[PDB]
Write an enzyme that holds these catalytic residues in place. Sequence first.
Site, PDB file in Angstrom:
ATOM      1  N   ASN A  88      -6.294  -0.026   5.261  1.00 29.53           N
ATOM      2  CA  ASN A  88      -5.266   0.498   4.375  1.00 29.53           C
ATOM      3  C   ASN A  88      -4.526  -0.689   3.768  1.00 29.53           C
ATOM      4  OD1 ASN A  88      -5.833   3.300   5.188  1.00 29.53           O
ATOM      5  ND2 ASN A  88      -4.832   2.773   7.122  1.00 29.53           N
TER       6      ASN A  88
ATOM      7  N   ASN B 183      -5.016   6.590  11.642  1.00 32.35           N
ATOM      8  CA  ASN B 183      -4.641   5.192  11.379  1.00 32.35           C
ATOM      9  C   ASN B 183      -4.038   4.507  12.607  1.00 32.35           C
ATOM     10  OD1 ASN B 183      -1.912   6.597   9.786  1.00 32.35           O
ATOM     11  ND2 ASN B 183      -1.444   4.905  11.184  1.00 32.35           N
TER      12      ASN B 183
ATOM     13  N   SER C 167      -3.009  -1.725   8.172  1.00 29.90           N
ATOM     14  CA  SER C 167      -3.509  -0.867   9.242  1.00 29.90           C
ATOM     15  C   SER C 167      -4.929  -0.451   8.886  1.00 29.90           C
ATOM     16  CB  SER C 167      -2.561   0.307   9.426  1.00 29.90           C
ATOM     17  OG  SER C 167      -2.625   1.206   8.327  1.00 29.90           O
TER      18      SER C 167
ATOM     19  N   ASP D 223      -1.473  -1.238   3.811  1.00 31.46           N
ATOM     20  CA  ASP D 223      -0.445  -1.862   4.644  1.00 31.46           C
ATOM     21  C   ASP D 223      -1.041  -2.714   5.744  1.00 31.46           C
ATOM     22  OD1 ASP D 223      -1.393   0.031   6.479  1.00 31.46           O
ATOM     23  OD2 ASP D 223       0.389   1.289   6.383  1.00 31.46           O
TER      24      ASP D 223
ATOM     25  N   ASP E 125       3.047  16.909  14.242  1.00 34.96           N
ATOM     26  CA  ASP E 125       4.085  15.917  14.032  1.00 34.96           C
ATOM     27  C   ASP E 125       5.280  16.449  13.246  1.00 34.96           C
ATOM     28  OD1 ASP E 125       3.875  12.401  12.893  1.00 34.96           O
ATOM     29  OD2 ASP E 125       5.094  13.381  14.431  1.00 34.96           O
TER      30      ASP E 125
ATOM     31  N   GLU F 164     -12.611  12.747   4.388  1.00 36.93           N
ATOM     32  CA  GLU F 164     -12.153  11.497   4.993  1.00 36.93           C
ATOM     33  C   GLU F 164     -13.296  10.554   5.334  1.00 36.93           C
ATOM     34  OE1 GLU F 164      -9.317  10.459   5.107  1.00 36.93           O
ATOM     35  OE2 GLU F 164      -7.842  12.097   5.200  1.00 36.93           O
TER      36      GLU F 164
ATOM     37  N   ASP G 263      -7.993   2.871   9.197  1.00 36.80           N
ATOM     38  CA  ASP G 263      -8.280   4.281   9.473  1.00 36.80           C
ATOM     39  C   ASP G 263      -9.595   4.376  10.228  1.00 36.80           C
ATOM     40  OD1 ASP G 263      -5.995   5.330   8.179  1.00 36.80           O
ATOM     41  OD2 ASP G 263      -7.078   6.175   6.483  1.00 36.80           O
TER      42      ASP G 263
END
Length: 129
Positions: free
Chosen positions: A46, A59, A50, A48, A101, A35, A52
């Site tokens: 990202n 994110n 957003s 979209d 999650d 990462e 990271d």
Amino acid sequence: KVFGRCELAAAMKRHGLDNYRGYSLGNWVCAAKFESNFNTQATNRNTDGSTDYGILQINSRWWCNDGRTPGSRNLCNIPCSALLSSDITASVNCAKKIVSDGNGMNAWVAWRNRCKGTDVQAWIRGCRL
Ligand SMILES: [Cl-]
């Protein structure tokens, strides 16, 4: 902070990630490697809109607040800059939330595409733990 491999393994282990939700430490070290290349200050935007943040590229859509992600949920209840600190406490505690999650470490696309199913124990090779 740019962590060494065994340095980061040591820190993650101390913060309780070894076998957290059944994931062995090497899974976590492997994820961080791909990462962020073990760099706490890593950031990546990202598609979209957003972003990271940090060693595990957490994110801003769901997990931290960066004030520029509409729809943000800030589930770790932290500014995203906290995820960039040399002290990885905020990142680890947030990751604990994410992996719990429902989709496990599949939440991290680099884990799924680059670590999952591989010999992740190699990542802790040589380290005193
Ligand atoms: Cl290395």
